[PDB]
């Protein structure tokens, strides 16, 4: 396919583990089409270093910034694709991705690990505790004070 | 008739004692505020136009007084204050301003509690004012939103409305062809007819693109009927004599047999509707009135030849009663678009909020009326179709509409339907005239009416002084007479119960 | 070079104002390439950098440069000829060949001249103006241009090649990943938004990478879409291979973004590897941390003993992130902050952003300072308001940084940074906005926080203004709280700072204590501290953390000094810690709160905290089954302070448990005491739940009507707000024996809220009126009838006009009636149902089987009957004339011919059913001929009059539940249209009424021939309103939405009754018509063929197997019923992704609350017509469910082969990870929120299937006498413990496996499904 001319057509504090930047370079190539050199095929097709920190961060051990992204990028896997990426990841073996999760896991295994008198006031009141007075002679008593009360204030 | 500046006056009452220091004014205006708020309430729940509107909200949230005057009559505040969050910018930053005093000085359950309505409205009108495009109005409402807590986001018992489509019929569609492909494609016109219709209405647009549309409204008014009308067989077939001899149909067409519009049906009224606006609109009359015109001219013909004559449809043909088959429908519908559809535009445009559309509605029954005149012989006869059934009732409806221009739109329908139109005729049509404007005078009762009930009342008199005046000695037919002894005792009936 | 520097200066002309300009720029780019539909698609995806255009919605351009490839010259046409007017000269080409054959003035000629030439003008009209003055207006609108760009382009999309497709698509999937779209990031809409809304509808698909499409969603607003998307593609991969693991993980991670626990977790429990971490899932989304925290710890445990042995794949690291990322929210959930800061700071494993989080609550000012550097140079853009409102934090609190000048400048910029996150969420509100709408309260402390710390310094400190403003900000805060829904980091969050700023407060007075030398500033900041401690353990234990409580709680001793209120209920909270624990633990956490109570030194507490001590003391030794302790610890409570409502409602708890047993009446009236003097207060919400105990009481009557005394002593006082929501059960008590002595009781009510009573009463009086006439078939009325017409003369005497208005309404009513026709539709409708339900019975022997003389009376009441106070007179004299319609009479005639019985073979059932059909699709096609709506002055003057001014009447049902406020919605109009609407397999008349607010409400006026099971319908729709406060007062229901959709019922005579309708409501049975009608199909054609195939097999001498049922099952959706049908209705109807999203979960909800309670209340099965789905919304109702009680036994049985409709279009619809996740997780909630025994819903269900057994009783077994006290307590105890059996089974979540899984496999299962009966449609 090749696109139609146009008339402007002139005539980082956390190591990178390699899976991140297998994830990196897999995304530059795949998802934007770009060459290793980031040389534009297509006008329209601009990088785009905002979705590849995306696809990043997606399995990453801490947020990559698409700044970060971008330097590391041009700073490492350039140099380095110019061992390639590939052949580090296939010879890790997901060794070192294993080893971190197994370190977090003790980490947080390790967190885990660390992990009368009474009489007196009722006589005061009037209240014979140990006799006690059935709901209806209480009601009575909440009645008889109800009109005493309005009595006094009238 | 005219009740803005009374609306201006209390505005600017209220504007005079809002310096505060007034307190011998906010005394004496403690009385009245349950009353003015009460009817404030009333007016702004009403259908008005936008300025009206307005103004009835500000009203309802600047009345000169201590919030804490306001705590008993709070409930009434709700409704204007959602309305303002819904409204103008102007009226957003107000309605926030208001809600934020509520907010800071009153307790949060009393105002939880007074919110409860509302709340579903308030909730929601807060969370689109967050998108307000003025930085100030969704920082206000930012933090008018912090400041409700959790209430802001407590489950709405009335939820958000969802956009449903309940029609699987394509709309209308213009064909385009893509010789490269060797291929058509159809082009969707609803939305074009309704964004046409938009520009048209709104006084904003630029007069290039109410050109724009009013092409857009024509064009589609085109592709959407036959054309395939010859001179000679049009000739042929309204010169028959069945047209001027043969006895017109007693059919009627009641709305009340029309099912739910389709899109088809209602794209045509929203574009017959664009062309009337186009027609009102000074730099587009010259080229859309006369084209207005002939368009009702020829909804006319095909009306009238569908309804009489030779070839008459089998549902307008003698004995048939009111059916679906009149109108364009999903199910069983007509044969095509009915021309009935311009009556509905006619309406519409009788209805209207901005009134100088009514004259074009009247030029349009006037055109009708012209040609049925031509084509049957006789204004007698012209008066005794179907179609005219089908304009006293969409227009005596225009008068049960709830809106005050609408029901304006239906009294100057019926005055203009019993001035032009035969005696005969606006005496067998006496009594629903009658029953319309009587509607109109009740449910305008306690309502600001801008003069439709001085307009009905005037109305009612010169249709009652028309058909109760009494015939002349050489005026005196049987079937006049028998025509005005039956409407007299039916119109007598009906006031004397009023009474 | 000149050209390639100027082009930002070309797209400006392109998108130009002025529309010269933008002419002149289109036509240089027009011809600067080809005129094909091909290469311009090719030139706008690969060839143009739309970066330069910056916000302009440049897809107004590709309209613009795609449509000028079409043909201008050819004359302007459609494809829709159905939808033309027609010629004029059309008429004749429809008339027969005969009409033509026989057809072949000045002024009309000239009319028809100038027609002519009007025609010809048209004639020239061509398509090219259209397609001009449309781009011009798509170019005014971006509404209109988004529209037509995503109509257009699936077509252009129709009318390309498979080479051409195929390239466009490898070509659009890098423009999607283009940088150039990143300015249209804040743009609304983005053109990037609207280019893949086209791209979703092209045929054949376009396929996208799932991580594009989550990029594109979380970017772009396109979240549902790309949701939906992913979605299908996962379903068409059968949900592991790499690219099914990539859109499981997109998938996963745009339902976590979104807030979708429900989805989420469904999702991951069908993925996941690892039991536990399904385990784990499940604790953690009901709010079980702790067990959810233990199981990922299991589960890393197992996964380390793993690695050991072999390496990890790729595949199981999302399943180590998820116990990761969850391990941490658990901690954060079980307010574990400084092993979080720990854990953050670990060597090697450094988490500055959980730092950032963790470390400011407590008060590890130095990590905060590091977390928010480290953050600062590398954080997410969506937590940058998070990043200023911890700066803020910094610049407030740190020790030596303290910055208050720039607290005003940070909360600006993160409200700006919250409002522009709000902008790239979806339009409609949902749990992805509540952390934002969490951060507006937030940022607003930091501010008001800001204020308090200008105030205290030494400048300020001591000056009355400062004061002021401090104590104004302190009691906001108290007041302003987040709620039971919020996770519990959110509480955490704003009592910490609240808690730093309390703590500022007390430093500044104690350190200085010149000024204030009574310390009340330091109280008050003490005070303020106390409060939000104890406020923060009883949120942690409304939310089931009660060990995380009694930790928090445990802070209040840190504090040297304390108010004695702040003691109390820091004691109060304790004790309920303890009561909720012994809930389940039993006599050990009794024990521990009495030792509580009695180490309280009640020496300093007023007499109020006494009680309410002596109360919780109470309450435990009831539970310990120390009764007598337990009696004087109430006595001594109430004695005490004889107003705590909460003493005297636990006393009579005990009271009423210990007569139930031992069932001494002076125990019934003790309790029936201690209830009414519980309610003496206007908070009905909560007496609520002990009304219905004493409701329930009176069940226990004696002869001499002992316990209806003492309702009629003490219930005075009790205000008549409480007995509105009782009114239907107050009314089956007066008709009983006890009536005598609760009249006074509804007359009261009845003064106070007439509109309330009068219907109810007026109804009850009616259907006494006609059961008395069946029985003598004048009579003096009975002592019921007497009663009543008691209550209604007292309120016409003080309201009479009011109750003239509500009568003059009633009375209006009658012409709302149907016409014949429908009345004898609804009958044939109605029978056809009978017949089908017999058939069911009578499976067996198809083709042998023969009518019920049930049905047999019916058809012969049909024919007899053949469908035909002044208003009823006229009403009989318009019916009477309706009778001398001939058409009427030959229908009868012909009617009475088919449904001879004389006849040989006619009393065959499916004969019956048959001649049913065909007079139901005859008068179908006759019902559609009548007027679709009517107005209300042709008969009904009183409506239409009626006003404001006539009465202050309320808008039907404003009383069914009594509103918390006095805000009733008074009636106003009366709309003059009525409208007539096919609903509930009935005519039924839509009345509109506008309220005094405006609004218009819709109500259904609906004619039942049955008075019971109207009567038994409303009973039910009565306690699914009783039972939703419940939900509204626990989390994991609240946070779900959860909700019943009851609808106002209100029942004006024993015929007719105002329903409250939703007019953009359908039910499933309608919308499966619709499809058929689409298709062509009858809609009872599976039926027929069920039966059919069971003929066929039976006439084989043979029984139909489980697996002939499983393939006539199979059969139907194979041919007649897809699987597919309700998803399509649905995608059809909201083709925005959002709204579909929307409509999908609200469906899916409210179909978990109605399967729970067809299942728990033993209610009858759930037809498709009963299930209304209100399309505007989502949400559904059920008209409607009735108790299936057995009518020769009165138990509830219930136990059909299905819990409750899970059918598989409903399935396909919901999807799997809707039914697993949302449905499964709903109905866990509302069980478990329906068991927690605070509630009291055994009362509530005692109190309503009381009134149910008394209706069974008078229609199966029978002043009349009342059925015998014994077998009604024992009827409804049973009922009511069949009902909490099968609530409690639901609730039980030992092990984070629950029973409602199995109920929904035994639901959706095949087998269950193919045992029902068809005309429950378990295709549908
Ligand atoms: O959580 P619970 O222990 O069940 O009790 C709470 C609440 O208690 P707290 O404020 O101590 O959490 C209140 O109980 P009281 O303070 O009245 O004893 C009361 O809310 P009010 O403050 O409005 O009275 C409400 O009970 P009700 O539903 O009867 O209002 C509610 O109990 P629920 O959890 O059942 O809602």
């Known amino acids: 396919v090749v696109p139609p001319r146009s008339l402007f057509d002139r005539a980082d504090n956390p190591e990178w583990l390699i899976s991140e930047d297998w994830a990196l370079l897999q995304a530059v190539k795949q998802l934007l089409e770009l060459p290793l050199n980031l040389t534009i095929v297509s006008p329209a097709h601009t990088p785009n270093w905002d979705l590849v920190s995306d696809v990043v961060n997606s399995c990453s051990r801490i947020y990559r910034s698409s700044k970060q992204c971008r330097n590391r990028y041009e700073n490492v896997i350039i140099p380095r694709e110019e061992l390639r990426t590939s052949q580090i990841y296939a010879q890790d073996e997901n060794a070192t991705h294993t080893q971190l999760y197994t370190s977090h896991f003790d980490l947080m295994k390790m ?18 505790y140990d006799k006690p007075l059935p709901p209806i002679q209480v009601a009575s008593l909440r009645a008889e004070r109800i009109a005493k009360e309005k009595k006094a204030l009238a | 008739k005219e009740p803005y500046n009374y609306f201006l006056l209390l505005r600017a009452l209220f504007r005079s004692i809002g310096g505060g220091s007034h307190d011998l004014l906010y005394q004496e205006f403690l009385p009245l505020l349950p009353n003015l708020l009460q009817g404030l309430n009333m007016l702004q729940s009403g259908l008005h136009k936008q300025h009206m509107k307005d103004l009835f909200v500000e009203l309802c949230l600047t009345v000169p007084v201590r919030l804490s005057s306001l705590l008993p009559y709070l409930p009434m505040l709700m409704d204007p204050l959602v309305s303002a969050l819904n409204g103008s910018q102007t009226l957003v930053s107000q309605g926030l301003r208001t809600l ?23 909730m929601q009108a807060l969370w689109r004012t967050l998108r307000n495009p003025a930085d100030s109005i969704s920082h206000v409402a930012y933090r008018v939103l912090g400041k409700f807590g959790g209430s802001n986001r407590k489950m709405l018992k009335e939820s958000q409305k969802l956009h449903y489509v309940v029609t699987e019929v394509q709309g209308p569609s213009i064909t385009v062809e893509f010789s490269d492909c060797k291929a058509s494609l159809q082009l969707p016109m609803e939305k074009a007819i309704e964004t046409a219709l938009d520009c048209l209405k709104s006084a904003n647009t630029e007069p290039y693109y109410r050109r724009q549309a009013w092409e857009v409204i024509k064009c589609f008014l085109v ?25 017109i149909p007693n059919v009627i067409i009641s709305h009340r047999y029309k099912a739910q519009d389709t899109p088809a049906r209602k794209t045509f009224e929203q574009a017959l509707t664009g062309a009337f606006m186009s027609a009102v609109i000074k730099d587009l009359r010259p080229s859309a009135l006369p084209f207005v015109a002939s368009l009702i001219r020829h909804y006319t013909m095909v009306a009238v030849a569908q309804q009489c004559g030779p070839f008459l449809l089998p549902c307008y043909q003698v004995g048939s009663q009111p059916s679906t088959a009149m109108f364009h429908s999903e199910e069983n519908g007509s044969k095509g678009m009915d021309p009935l559809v311009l009556i509905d535009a006619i309406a519409i445009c009788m209805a209207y909020e901005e009134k100088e559309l009514c004259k074009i509605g009247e030029v349009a029954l006037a055109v009708i009326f012209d040609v049925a005149s031509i084509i049957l012989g006789s204004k007698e006869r012209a008066c005794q179709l179907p179609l005219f059934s089908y304009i006293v009732e969409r227009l005596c409806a225009c008068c049960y509409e709830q809106a005050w221009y609408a029901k304006l739109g239906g009294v100057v329908s019926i005055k203009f339907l019993m001035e032009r139109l035969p005696l005969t005729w606006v005496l067998q049509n006496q009594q629903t005239f009658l029953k319309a404007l009587l509607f109109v005078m009740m449910d305008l009762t306690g309502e600001v009416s801008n003069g439709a009930v001085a307009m009905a009342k005037t109305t009612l008199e010169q249709l009652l002084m028309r058909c109760a005046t009494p015939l002349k000695d050489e005026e005196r037919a049987e079937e006049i007479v028998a025509a005005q002894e039956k409407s007299f005792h039916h119109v007598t009936h009906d006031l004397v119960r009023e009474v | 070079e000149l050209t390639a520097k100027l082009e930002p200066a070309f797209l400006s002309g392109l998108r130009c104002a002025q529309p010269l300009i933008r002419a002149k720029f289109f036509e240089v780019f027009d011809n600067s390439m080809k005129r094909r539909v091909y290469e311009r698609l090719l030139y706008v995806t690969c060839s143009q950098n739309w970066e330069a255009m910056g916000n302009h919605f440049w897809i107004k351009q590709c309209i613009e440069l795609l449509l000028a490839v079409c043909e201008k010259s050819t004359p302007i046409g459609t494809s829709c000829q159905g939808a033309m007017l027609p010629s004029i000269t059309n008429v004749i080409n429809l008339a027969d060949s005969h009409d033509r054959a026989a057809f072949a003035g000045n002024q009309l000629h000239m009319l028809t001249n100038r027609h002519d030439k009007f025609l010809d003008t048209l004639r020239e009209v061509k398509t090219g103006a259209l397609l001009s003055a449309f781009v011009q207006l798509c170019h005014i609108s971006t509404t209109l241009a988004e529209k037509t760009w995503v109509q257009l382009f699936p077509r252009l999309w129709k009318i390309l090649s498979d080479r051409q497709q195929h390239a466009l698509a490898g070509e659009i999937s890098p423009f999607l990943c283009s940088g150039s779209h990143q300015v249209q990031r804040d743009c609304q809409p983005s053109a990037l938004n609207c280019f893949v809304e086209a791209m979703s509808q092209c045929v054949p698909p376009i396929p996208i990478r799932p991580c594009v499409l989550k990029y594109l969603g979380k970017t772009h607003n396109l979240w549902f879409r790309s949701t939906l998307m992913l979605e299908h593609q996962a379903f068409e991969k059968g949900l592991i291979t790499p690219p099914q693991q990539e859109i499981l993980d997109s998938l996963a991670e745009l339902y976590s973004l979104l807030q979708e626990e429900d989805m989420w977790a469904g999702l991951w429990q069908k993925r996941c590897k690892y039991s536990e971490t399904a385990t784990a899932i499940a604790y953690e989304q009901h709010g079980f941390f702790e ?13 380390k003993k793993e690695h050991e042995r072999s390496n990890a794949s790729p595949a199981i690291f999302p399943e180590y992130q998820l116990w990761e990322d969850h391990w941490i929210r658990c901690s954060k959930e079980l307010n574990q902050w400084e092993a979080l800061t720990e854990y953050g700071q670990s060597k090697g494993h450094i988490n500055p952003y959980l730092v950032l989080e963790c470390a400011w609550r407590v008060s590890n000012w130095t990590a905060m300072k590091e977390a928010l550097v480290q953050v600062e140079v590398s954080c997410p853009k969506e937590m940058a308001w998070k990043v200023n409102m911890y700066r803020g934090y910094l610049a407030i609190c ?30 409609v509100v949902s749990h992805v906005h509540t952390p934002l709408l969490q951060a507006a309260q937030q940022i607003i402390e930091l501010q008001e926080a800001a204020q308090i710390n200008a105030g205290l310094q030494p400048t300020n400190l001591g000056r009355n203004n400062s004061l002021h403003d401090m104590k104004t900000v302190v009691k906001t805060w108290r007041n302003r709280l987040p709620i039971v829904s919020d996770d519990l980091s959110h509480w955490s969050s704003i009592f910490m700072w609240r808690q730093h700023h309390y703590q500022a407060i007390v430093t500044a007075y104690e350190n200085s204590s010149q000024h204030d030398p009574s310390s009340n500033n330091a109280m008050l900041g003490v005070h303020a501290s106390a409060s939000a401690i104890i406020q923060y353990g009883k949120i942690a234990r409304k939310q089931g953390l009660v060990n995380v409580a009694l930790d928090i709680l445990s802070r209040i001793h840190t504090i040297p000094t304390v108010p004695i209120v702040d003691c109390f209920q820091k004691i109060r909270q304790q004790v309920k810690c303890y009561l909720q624990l012994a809930g389940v633990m039993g006599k050990n956490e009794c024990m521990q709160g009495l030792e509580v109570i009695e180490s309280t030194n009640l020496k300093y507490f007023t007499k109020e905290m006494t009680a309410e001590f002596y109360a919780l003391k109470g ?11 337990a009696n004087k610890a109430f006595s001594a409570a109430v004695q005490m302070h004889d107003v705590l409502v909460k003493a005297w409602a636990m006393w009579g708890d005990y009271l009423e448990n210990i007569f139930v047993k031992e069932r001494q009446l002076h125990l019934g009236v003790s309790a029936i005491t201690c209830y009414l003097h519980a309610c003496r207060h206007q908070n009905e919400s909560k007496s609520r739940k002990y009304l219905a105990k004493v409701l329930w009481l009176l069940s226990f009557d004696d ?31 007066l008709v009983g024996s006890e009536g005598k002595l609760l009249l006074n009781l509804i007359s009261q009510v009845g003064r106070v809220y007439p509109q309330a009573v009068y219907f109810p009463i007026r109804t009850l009086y009616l259907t006494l009126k006609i059961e008395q006439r069946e029985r003598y078939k004048p009579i003096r009325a009975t002592a019921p009838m007497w009663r009543c017409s008691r209550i209604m003369h007292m309120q016409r005497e003080l309201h009479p006009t009011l109750l003239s208005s509500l009568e003059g309404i009633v009375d209006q009513m009658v012409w709302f009636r149907e016409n014949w026709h429908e009345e004898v539709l609804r009958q044939l409708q109605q029978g056809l149902a009978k017949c089908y339900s017999v058939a069911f019975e009578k499976s067996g022997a198809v083709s042998d089987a023969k009518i019920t003389p049930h049905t047999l009376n019916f058809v012969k009441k049909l024919v007899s009957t053949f469908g035909v106070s002044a208003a009823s007179e006229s009403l009989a004299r318009r019916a009477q004339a309706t009778a001398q319609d001939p058409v009427f009479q030959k229908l009868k005639g012909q009617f009475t011919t088919d449904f001879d019985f004389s006849v040989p073979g006619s009393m065959k059932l499916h004969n019956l059913i048959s001649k049913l059909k065909k007079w139901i699709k005859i008068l179908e096609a006759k019902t559609k001929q009548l007027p679709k709506f009517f107005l209300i002055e042709e008969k009904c003057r009183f409506l239409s009059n009626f006003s404001a001014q006539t009465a202050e009447v309320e808008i039907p049902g404003e009383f069914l539940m009594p509103k918390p406020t006095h805000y009733y919605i008074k009636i106003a109009r009366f709309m003059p249209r009525v409208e007539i609407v096919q609903k509930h397999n009935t005519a039924a008349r839509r009345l509109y009424i ?72 359908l039910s499933l049975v309608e919308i499966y018509k619709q499809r058929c009608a689409k298709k062509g199909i009858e809609h009872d054609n599976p039926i027929s063929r069920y039966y059919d195939r069971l003929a066929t097999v039976q006439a084989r001498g043979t029984q139909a197997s489980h697996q002939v049922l499983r393939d006539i099952l199979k059969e139907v959706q194979s041919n007649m019923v897809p699987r597919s049908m309700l998803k399509e209705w649905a995608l059809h109807t909201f083709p925005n992704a959002t709204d579909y999203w929307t409509f999908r979960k609200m469906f899916t909800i409210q179909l978990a609350l109605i399967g729970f309670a067809e299942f728990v209340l033993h209610l009858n099965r759930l037809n498709p017509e009963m299930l209304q789905i209100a399309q505007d919304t989502g949400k559904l109702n059920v008209a409607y469910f009735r108790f299936d009680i057995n009518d020769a036994t009165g138990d509830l049985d219930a136990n059909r082969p299905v819990p409750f409709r899970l059918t598989p279009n409903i399935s396909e619809f919901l999807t799997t990870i809707g039914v697993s996740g949302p449905l499964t997780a709903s109905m866990i909630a509302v069980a478990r929120c329906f068991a927690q025994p605070n509630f009291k819903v055994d009362g509530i269900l005692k109190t309503v299937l009381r009134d149910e057994i008394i209706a069974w009783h008078k229609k199966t077994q029978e002043q009349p006498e009342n059925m015998d006290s014994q077998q009604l307590v024992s009827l409804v105890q049973k009922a009511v413990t069949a009902i909490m059996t099968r609530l409690h089974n639901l609730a039980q979540f030992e092990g984070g496996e629950s029973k409602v899984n199995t109920l929904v496999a035994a639901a959706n299962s095949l087998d269950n499904l193919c045992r029902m009966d068809p005309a429950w449609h378990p295709w549908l």
Request: hydrophobic letters at 40%; glycine letters at 2%.
């Open chain 3, 994 to 1065: 506008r309220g005094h607010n405006g609004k218009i409400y819709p109500y259904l006026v609906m004619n039942d021939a049955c008075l019971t099971e109207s009567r038994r319908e409303e009973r039910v729709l009565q306690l699914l309103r009783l039972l939703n406060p419940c939900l509204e007062k626990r989390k994991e229901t609240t946070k779900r939405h959860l909700f019943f959709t009851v609808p106002r019922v209100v029942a004006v005579s024993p015929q007719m009754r105002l329903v409250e309708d939703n007019p953009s409501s």
């Open chain 2, 100 to 122: 934020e005093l509520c907010v800071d000085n009153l307790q949060p359950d009393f105002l939880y509690d007074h919110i409860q309505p509302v709340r579903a409205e308030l």
């Open chain 1, 111 to 128: 967190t885990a690990g660390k992990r009368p008198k009474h009489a007196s006031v009722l006589a005061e009141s009037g209240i014979n």
């Open chain 3, 291 to 303: 067990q959810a925290q233990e199981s990922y710890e299991k589960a890393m445990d197992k996964a």
């Open chain 3, 398 to 427: 740190h020790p030596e940084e303290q910055q208050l000048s720039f607290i005003e400048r940070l909360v600006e910029m993160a409200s700006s940074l919250a409002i522009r996150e709000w902008r790239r969420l979806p339009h």
């Open chain 3, 619 to 629: 309450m435990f030794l009831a539970q310990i089954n120390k009764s007598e302790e």
């Open chain 2, 223 to 247: 592709a959407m009927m036959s054309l395939e009308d010859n001179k000679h067989a049009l000739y042929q077939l309204l010169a028959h004599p069945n047209f001027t001899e043969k006895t």
């Open chain 3, 703 to 733: 002869d001499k009507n002992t316990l209806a005394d003492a309702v009629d002593k003490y219930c005075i006082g009790v205000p008549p707000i409480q007995w509105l929501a009782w009114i239907p059960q107050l009314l089956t008590c």
